[PDB]
């Protein structure tokens, strides 16, 4: 996977800050099914 | 984005409906009231800060 899966977790607007949030994420580097 | 946060759990900046645009939330002045007093023996007149 990757560093992919993050998607914003509101609509909430934050400019320059690090925010810590626990919502349904997909792991980094985790293993991902794929199919041709 | 519909309002933004800042550092602190707090309100910065709002999508202000009916314009589409931003508006910064500042919190309105407030702050303590202290009275310059030379002393009742001195004077009666003070000065407010």
Redesign the interface.
Known sequence: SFTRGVYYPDKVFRSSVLHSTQDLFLPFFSNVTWFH | ???????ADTTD?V?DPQTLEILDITPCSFGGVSVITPGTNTSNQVAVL
């Open positions: 984005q519909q309002f933004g946060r800042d550092i900046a999508r």
